[PDB]
């Protein structure tokens, strides 16, 4: 396998890890804050997916400093992973076009 393809899967594994720990930490950070809704694990994991993908429907979000910090790591991991897949798909097409040009 090629590097870019390795980094892709890697980012996918790391992202799944960030999503899991992210859901766990959000609950830990949010419980204690009156009015907080990101306080049970199942929905927190859903929240983490809509954060990593940037869809952010707005049905769930952190209201605490530490929950927001956790949110940032998740957004950055998501944006970075998905952007890394784009870059991998780009390197793949560029190589194929090189062959197709007999270069």
């Amino acid at each position, epitope marked *: 396998s090629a590097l870019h393809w390795r980094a892709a899967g890697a980012a996918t594994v790391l992202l799944v890890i960030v999503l899991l720990a992210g859901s766990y930490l959000a609950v830990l950070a*949010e419980r204690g804050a*009156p*009015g907080a809704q990101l306080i049970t694990y199942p929905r927190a994991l859903w929240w983490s997916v809509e954060t990593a993908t940037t869809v952010g429907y707005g049905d769930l979000y952190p209201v605490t400093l530490w929950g927001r910090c956790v949110a940032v790591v998740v957004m950055v991991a998501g944006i970075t992973s998905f952007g890394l897949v784009t870059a991998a798909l780009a390197t793949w097409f560029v190589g194929r076009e090189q062959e197709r040009r007999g270069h």
Partner: antibody
Amino acid sequence: QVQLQQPGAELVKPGASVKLSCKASGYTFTSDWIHWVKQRPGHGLEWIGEIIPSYGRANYNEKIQKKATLTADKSSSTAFMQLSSLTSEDSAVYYCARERGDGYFAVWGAGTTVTVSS
Amino acid sequence: DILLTQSPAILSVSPGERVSFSCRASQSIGTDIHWYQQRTNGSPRLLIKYASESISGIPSRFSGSGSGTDFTLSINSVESEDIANYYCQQSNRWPFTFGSGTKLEI
């Protein structure tokens, strides 16, 4: 088998303090939270606070005066609630309950009857 | 902090009839409401979770419905063993809260 084991009772002198225990068993997940609920005779249930043993973090009901302190012992699977400077208003049954981090109390202890008296 | 109102406080029904306990939330809480039964001297027991999901070991006679701010716990054909206090509890927003409870009287 009984999943939460609590001592049947505790007598306490006004001003003194007591440390209630709650030994757990059955399935345990680092994601579990142990809650404490207070029920004065003839009254309803009142949430006191919660703790997650795997991290030792604890949260308390803000609406009521804080007379509790939660700690836990990961090795013996035991949750502790330290009640301090008690008065007759603190006389009641104190239950502990396990929550899998999904919002509801699947299991409860039999409760500890605490009496504040000389 | 979400306020849960359980009214009436006492409910009287004849044997075998269908009974309904009410629970209203001060704000919208989806379906994050749970029901417990507490008999005299006993400890609370989970009956229904998330407004309508049944718990194993609980008679099929118990059901729940509702969403938003209004919720109902029903018992099809009540019987002596159902005599007890019933509480609701929300987990939508921190901190979790309980209703004042409703006594069933036959």
